[PDB]
Amino acid sequence: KRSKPDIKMEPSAGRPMDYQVSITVIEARQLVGLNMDPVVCVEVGDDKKYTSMKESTNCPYYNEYFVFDFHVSPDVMFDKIIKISVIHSKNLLRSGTLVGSFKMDVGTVYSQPEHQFHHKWAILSDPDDISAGLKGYVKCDVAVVGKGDNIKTPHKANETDEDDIEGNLLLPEGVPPERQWARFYVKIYRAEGLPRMNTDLVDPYVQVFFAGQKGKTSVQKSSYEPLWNEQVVFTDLFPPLCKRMKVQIRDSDKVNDVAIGTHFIDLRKISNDGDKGFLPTLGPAWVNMYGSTRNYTLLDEHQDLNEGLGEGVSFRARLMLGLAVEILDTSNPELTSSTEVQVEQATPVSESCTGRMEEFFLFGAFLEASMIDRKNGDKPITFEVTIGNYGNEVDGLASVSSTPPMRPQITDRNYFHLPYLERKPCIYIKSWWPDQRRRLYNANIMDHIADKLEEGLNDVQEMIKTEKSYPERRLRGVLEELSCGCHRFLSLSDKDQGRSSRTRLDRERLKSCMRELESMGQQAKSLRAQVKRHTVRDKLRSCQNFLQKLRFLADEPQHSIPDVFIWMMSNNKRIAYARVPSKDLLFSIVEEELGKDCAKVKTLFLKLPGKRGFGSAGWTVQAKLELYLWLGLSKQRKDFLCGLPCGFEEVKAAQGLGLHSFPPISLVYTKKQAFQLRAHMYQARSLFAADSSGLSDPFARVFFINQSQCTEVLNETLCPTWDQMLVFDNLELYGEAHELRDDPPIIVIEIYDQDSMGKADFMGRTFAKPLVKMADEAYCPPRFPPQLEYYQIYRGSATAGDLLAAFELLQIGPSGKADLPPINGPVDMDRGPIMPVPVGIRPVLSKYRVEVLFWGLRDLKRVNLAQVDRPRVDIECAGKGVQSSLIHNYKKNPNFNTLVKWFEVDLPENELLHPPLNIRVVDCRAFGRYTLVGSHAVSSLRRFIYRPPMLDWWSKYFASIDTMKEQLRQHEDELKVYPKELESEFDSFEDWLHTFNLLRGKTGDDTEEERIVGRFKGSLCVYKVPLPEDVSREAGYDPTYGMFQGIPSNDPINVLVRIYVVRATDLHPADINGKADPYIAIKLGKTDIRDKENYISKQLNPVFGKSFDIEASFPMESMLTVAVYDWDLVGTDDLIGETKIDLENRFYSKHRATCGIAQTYSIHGYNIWRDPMKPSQILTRLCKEGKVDGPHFGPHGRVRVANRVFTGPSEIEDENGQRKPTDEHVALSALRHWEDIPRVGCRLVPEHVETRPLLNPDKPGIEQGRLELWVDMFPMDMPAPGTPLDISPRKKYELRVIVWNTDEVVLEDDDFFTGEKSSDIFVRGWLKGQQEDKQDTDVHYHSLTGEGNFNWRYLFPFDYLAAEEKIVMSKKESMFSWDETEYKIPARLTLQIWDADHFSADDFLGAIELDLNRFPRGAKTAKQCTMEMATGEVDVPLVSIFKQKRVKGWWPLLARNENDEFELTGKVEAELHLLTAEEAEKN
């Protein structure tokens, strides 16, 4: 396949769109400064915000969130810098001292696989001083997201998880952590070809921006060809995290300096990292520079094109440039330690290093110039072609550049055309460019193999779309051809070694492309063998991992010949432009090295320059040229007319009369051939909506050469069936048969919405190439007759539907129109000249029946600000359909009194060609004035076409969360924990019930929720014929309810929902201080419960443990929403997150999604069964609903469902402790293995929590945080359930120690009165921190050898959990906080021996820090205590007091000496004891 051409008016480049960056700075560490007061400043481009001030902390904590929003182009967003700085003593009076700064850019943060860095530590270096060392690190999370992106957020963990600096640096892949300094020389030499800005002179100077620094050269006053010869040096951290250098020529002025042009050097194209890579280098070579139009205007609206914001519409300058980096040793005292940008004199380079200036030649032939836009074509028009400054005759051999102006004639009401016919104007341009053709040839072979590969991937994507047989063989052939072209590029590009015009970048880029493309060829040859159908899609992605990087090869940073520009001018006022690259036009002998646009006629769509080329002004095209272009050496000009169609005869200018090889000013064609286009137009689907009713009036105009016709208008449909051909009679073309069959001409098809007057709104356009046939060839299969194909219409950037067409070009023969095929006349003869699509091309139709289950309608909005009372649904498929029964009142019952009804239509035989079914709800008000409430049409029927087939419950939560963590890590009692929406694993519970998303309004462009006017609930069943009896008995049991038998009841039923909110983690902070105060809000219908009375305070990871009961009247009250809210002391409360969980499909699924089913039964304790019915009654109800025999019972260990038997345990315990027999365990096992039923077998949800991502309307597609919750449904017409689960969040302990004596404590104090050494020994110890566990003993004054006597008892009461061995407490973070915050640490004790004084603080002598779970055992005597029991010797075992409960021993306390080791500075005899809270009151 892939006969369609891919042309788009709006590419990805140029269009500005909304981005935002979110930067949070969690904790700063390892900073430097004496009594410093840090503030973290975050800068993105031209703005910056500061955090709060912290006083005298070395490790401050901020956790402050910043969001920067911009609406800019993607390329200029990727060039914005990100600066994280730390400032000491910032104030407005005096500038604070800079501690450290870190530079980064937006574009490489976007280059992450998650478009973000999670928990990464910025290296806060010193940009102000190269010789200075590291100034600290700052942990941060930085994310870049624009509109239209869906991303997954990783675990936003606290300090209790991995937070180490070195393994989580703020680096991309492959960057070395030390980031050695470098000098970046750019060497601006010369320039040529400047325009006029004084009216007419210019005062240029080159300013270069990189990494937030800038440097400008001197100004060469009054010179259009200036010579700067100056070099600008930067210094930054190699490798540069910023990936672009903005070099910009500027015209200096005394009031407002403006821009000449701007070129962006992408540093990835000129560099390679690693030990096999090479340092950044470029040039000395010429760089082309494009911008706005060269003629001066005082109010130029295209000024931003000179700044690089968009696409250059004309050539503006050529700049000689060089670049070279070097790594400098910053420890050398020979060089100054400065950092700022410097401008010095550069070394002059000869022109022979960039290639000799040499004369090139451009030839162009304007064959066709049609579809000129009407609002400009009242004047005669021209076509000015300029390459470089050559051909700029308007602004200022004799080269010609313009076609002769002559008036445009009428084609239709929307476009003119130009009557060239046989007189084709031509242009010839002499030019002088350097001899760097080999660079363009290498980039051209790169682009040629990349174009072949991209054509292969688009072809196999089309065979994926149309389900053609074995695309894996096409993939293997594509990879083999890619390897063959790879070896061709290996054997081709290396033969021009002898020239000395190669720069420093040429050899390095050729070698790097050699190595990388050898790796690509061997990787493609290895990937060819593993291509398989069932894993084809990932293989496609691997091919994309080739192709884009191949384009990364093809982009040349040192382009020699500038792009050619083809313009339009009406009375010498510029209208529209096209810009063709010159690597595609260069002529050469080898076919892969030959340009893809050289010596062939190509279609070329002009467009408005700059900002007028975007949006609604850029809908209609400005011209559709059929241009022949050739570019190359004048000694290679021997065959620059060979690719042209034959039959032409030259006419030259006055200077070239009688010459041999003078290029012609014009051509006259004599070999005219007549043709006819049969524009087959069968259908369209999913078109754009251009009326306020949500539908349109589509009629399509077909444009071919100069003729244009329109198919008839159909009314109030987005999927029309015109059933019409457009006969363009007696076309004329010029050429021969072999130059036209493989390259047919272009047909452009636009669709318009007819309105109440003569104007018509726009739908977009598509393009086509007709099936071409000659007189000598016959109408043989499989080429003829042409089959209808799908043509993708694009309304600019956004897609706007498909189109059904079978275009064919047919030449007339020597017998005239008698050699034309027999035209099938109109069966409906009332249409007259409207001739339908003939047979063979028209899809052969067959009888189909559509049976529609009309279940209900949900949340329809107002029509003309009036409420909807009595809906009805019309259904249209292939023009005919059935209408639903009326409902009586929407507010009390939004359901139809009968459900199943059918209709008979004709549909095509193959399912790929099916027209879309269109449902339309309309209000049936009085007096027959029915208006459109909603419409849903875009659907494929393939899914509907039938074919015959001490423990608590938290311990159970821990025993499941660790298993799901183990399974997640191995991929990269117990409940089945689900990590996402339950709908994603259980296909939104759409077994028979389907939700069709119901639309009214114009289709959105550059949301669907604003178009939402409700949704339809129901099902479709479309089938050809009644099948044999065993298959058709599904409908044969009850024709009243049709094929949808097995349906459950439709009448309203009363229900309670029981929502359990377990916990939540990774909350986005509602408050700006990185904290939140969460509480659950729940809404369902009229019910809204907000539990503000039982909030959790100062928590981003709430342990909730809450259960709520909500009344609901189904089917109206089936739209539950669960949200988390933040308490605010003043003002209004701010929402944190909100999730939607609908209950219609959950209740009415076969999967039993009302309540989960546990792993096993227990009638007491932590595994209590919350559902009121036993599982025996549960599968009794499921067997009665699903037409299943069973359940059957025998002994208590077996249960029979259908023809299968399952097993399980027999006895079960209650709270009294005595066993009882039951068979409900085996019933629950049958519920677990319910998938094995041969007819009604599907999956069932187990008892779960779901980790639903909470979304926000402000950030679509972005998870603010994950919420652990699960819902239960219990219909109240069955008996009510009991007490809900005790999921409420949580043992208290007493640690007591006694210090008996001390020995060998170091005598720190010399005696003031007698002189001997002594020590006032006393003890101190604490578990948690300062304000809670600080206690000390009495002082043993004046020790002689370290002996002391205390006999003092400590006591530490606390809370504790043994699941993670964590001591549990909540305390205020600061004295200014409102209330307490929860903290977790492991079991710690810190013991110290001090030296008391009567007048000041005590002197530190010794310390130990031990764990109650793994401390080494104590000595038996004081003298047995040695150094080995405290250090890291493995010979000393460990004792846990949680199993021992009594420890007596001697233990050494260790000073903090300067030798980084431990020294015996004291011994302590200690008794250590553990009690509970109840035992502590009497022990």
Instruction: Check whether the bond before 195 is cis (ω within 30° of 0).
Output: no
Among 10, 454, 1247, 1395, binds Ca ion (CB under 5 A): 1395
Smallest separation (angstroms) from Ca ion to the CB of 1299: 18
Smallest separation (angstroms) from Ca ion to the CB of 1393: 12
User: How far is it, in rounded angstroms, from Cα 1482 to Cα 1124?
Assistant: 45
Among 236, 592, 753, 1224, binds Ca ion (CB under 5 A): 753
Find the distance separating the first CA and the last CA of the chain, reported in whole Å. Answer: 88
Among 200, 1134, 1185, 1479, binds Ca ion (CB under 5 A): 1134
Task: Enumerate the β-bridge partners of residue 1255.
Answer: 1138
User: How far is it, in rounded angstroms, from Cα 1255 to Cα 1235?
Assistant: 33
Smallest separation (angstroms) from Ca ion to the CB of 1098: 9
Smallest separation (angstroms) from Ca ion to the CB of 1070: 4
Kindly state whether residue 1144 participates in binding Ca ion, applying the rule CB under 5 A.
no
CA 1310 to chain CA mean position, Å: 72
User: How far is it, in rounded angstroms, from Cα 763 to Cα 714?
Assistant: 14
Nearer to Ca ion, 740 or 1339 (CB): 1339
Measured from the Cβ of residue 164, the count of other Cβ atoms closer than 10 Å reads 9
Using the rule CB under 5 A, give the single segment among 585-593, 598-606, 690-698, 776-784 that binds Ca ion. Answer: 690-698
Nearer to Ca ion, 378 or 1397 (CB): 1397
Smallest separation (angstroms) from Ca ion to the CB of 1376: 15
DSSP characters over 155-209: ----TTS---SGGGBS--TT--SS--EEEEEEEEEEEE-----------EEEEEE
Kindly state whether residue 983 participates in binding Ca ion, applying the rule CB under 5 A.
no
User: How far is it, in rounded angstroms, from Cα 1381 to Cα 971?
Assistant: 35
Among 1126, 1171, 1224, 1268, binds Ca ion (CB under 5 A): 1126
Smallest separation (angstroms) from Ca ion to the CB of 1077: 5
Kindly state whether residue 1320 participates in binding Ca ion, applying the rule CB under 5 A.
yes
Contact code string over 1069-1108 relative to Ca ion, x by CB under 5 A: -xx-----x-------------------------------
Contact code string over 1268-1307 relative to Ca ion, x by CB under 5 A: ----------------------------------------
Smallest separation (angstroms) from Ca ion to the CB of 1339: 9
User: How far is it, in rounded angstroms, from Cα 1133 to Cα 1128?
Assistant: 5
CA 17 to chain CA mean position, Å: 14
Using the rule CB under 5 A, give the single segment among 131-139, 146-154, 693-701, 1351-1359 that binds Ca ion. Answer: 693-701
Nearer to Ca ion, 1372 or 1445 (CB): 1372
Which residue's Cβ lies closest to Ca ion? 1134
- Please give the DSSP secondary-structure letter assigned to residue 1453: E
Q: Which amino acid is at 444?
A: N
| Residue count of the chain | 1483
Using the rule CB under 5 A, give the single segment among 86-94, 468-476, 757-765, 1292-1300 that binds Ca ion. Answer: 757-765
Nearer to Ca ion, 981 or 1309 (CB): 1309
Determine contact, residues 1055/1153, Cβ cutoff 8 Å: no
Q: Check residue 494 and give left, alpha or beta (phi > 0: left; psi -120 to 50: alpha).
A: alpha
Determine contact, residues 1389/1410, Cβ cutoff 8 Å: yes
Using the rule CB under 5 A, give the single segment among 493-501, 1007-1015, 1243-1251, 1397-1405 that binds Ca ion. Answer: 1397-1405
Determine contact, residues 505/560, Cβ cutoff 8 Å: no
Nearer to Ca ion, 1034 or 1309 (CB): 1309
Among 761, 789, 985, 1142, binds Ca ion (CB under 5 A): 761
Element housing 446 (H / E): helix 437-465
# binding residues, Ca ion (CB under 5 A): 16
Smallest separation (angstroms) from Ca ion to the CB of 1003: 12
Chain positions 221 to 250 lying near Ca ion, rule: CB under 5 A, are none
Smallest separation (angstroms) from Ca ion to the CB of 1377: 12
Smallest separation (angstroms) from Ca ion to the CB of 754: 6
User: How far is it, in rounded angstroms, from Cα 805 to Cα 1313?
Assistant: 113
- Long-range interactions of 861-865: CB distance < 8 A, separation 24+: 861/1012, 861/1013, 861/1014, 863/923, 863/931, 863/932, 863/933, 863/1000, 863/1013, 864/931
Smallest separation (angstroms) from Ca ion to the CB of 688: 11
Smallest separation (angstroms) from Ca ion to the CB of 690: 5
User: How far is it, in rounded angstroms, from Cα 129 to Cα 124?
Assistant: 12
Determine contact, residues 852/1018, Cβ cutoff 8 Å: yes
Task: Enumerate the β-bridge partners of residue 1193.
Answer: 1199
Using the rule CB under 5 A, give the single segment among 426-434, 508-516, 749-757, 768-776 that binds Ca ion. Answer: 749-757
Smallest separation (angstroms) from Ca ion to the CB of 1397: 4
Give the residue ranges of DSSP H helices in 972-1067.
982-985, 1029-1036
Kindly state whether residue 1379 participates in binding Ca ion, applying the rule CB under 5 A.
no
Nearer to Ca ion, 697 or 1117 (CB): 697
Smallest separation (angstroms) from Ca ion to the CB of 755: 4
Nearer to Ca ion, 202 or 1321 (CB): 1321
Nearer to Ca ion, 350 or 692 (CB): 692
User: How far is it, in rounded angstroms, from Cα 61 to Cα 31?
Assistant: 12
Task: Enumerate the β-bridge partners of residue 426.
Answer: 365
Determine contact, residues 960/953, Cβ cutoff 8 Å: no
Query: What are the tokens at 952?
Result: 């608590």
Smallest separation (angstroms) from Ca ion to the CB of 689: 9
Task: Enumerate the β-bridge partners of residue 1265.
Answer: 1254
Nearer to Ca ion, 203 or 1077 (CB): 1077
Kindly state whether residue 1402 participates in binding Ca ion, applying the rule CB under 5 A.
no
Kindly state whether residue 755 participates in binding Ca ion, applying the rule CB under 5 A.
yes
Nearer to Ca ion, 1128 or 1236 (CB): 1128
Measured from the Cβ of residue 777, the count of other Cβ atoms closer than 10 Å reads 13
Q: Helices then strands (H, E): number in the chain? A: 14, 76
Kindly state whether residue 716 participates in binding Ca ion, applying the rule CB under 5 A.
no
Smallest separation (angstroms) from Ca ion to the CB of 1122: 19
Kindly state whether residue 105 participates in binding Ca ion, applying the rule CB under 5 A.
no
Nearer to Ca ion, 307 or 716 (CB): 716
Dihedral (Cα; 984, 986, 992, 998), 10-degree rounding: -20
- Could you list the beta-strand ranges (E) of 581-640: 600-605, 624-633
Nearer to Ca ion, 789 or 1304 (CB): 1304
Kindly state whether residue 1397 participates in binding Ca ion, applying the rule CB under 5 A.
yes
Nearer to Ca ion, 1074 or 1165 (CB): 1074
Among 129, 691, 1111, 1304, binds Ca ion (CB under 5 A): 691
Cβ-Cβ contacts under 8 Å for 55 (sequence gap 6 or more) = 37
Kindly state whether residue 697 participates in binding Ca ion, applying the rule CB under 5 A.
yes
Using the rule CB under 5 A, give the single segment among 444-452, 1309-1317, 1427-1435, 1444-1452 that binds Ca ion. Answer: 1309-1317
Closest C-alpha to 460, from 520, 547, 518: 547
Kindly state whether residue 1128 participates in binding Ca ion, applying the rule CB under 5 A.
yes
Using the rule CB under 5 A, give the single segment among 153-161, 468-476, 1160-1168, 1388-1396 that binds Ca ion. Answer: 1388-1396
Nearer to Ca ion, 1369 or 1405 (CB): 1405
Residues that bind Ca ion (CB under 5 A): 690-691, 697, 753, 755, 761, 1070-1071, 1077, 1126, 1128, 1134, 1309, 1320, 1395, 1397
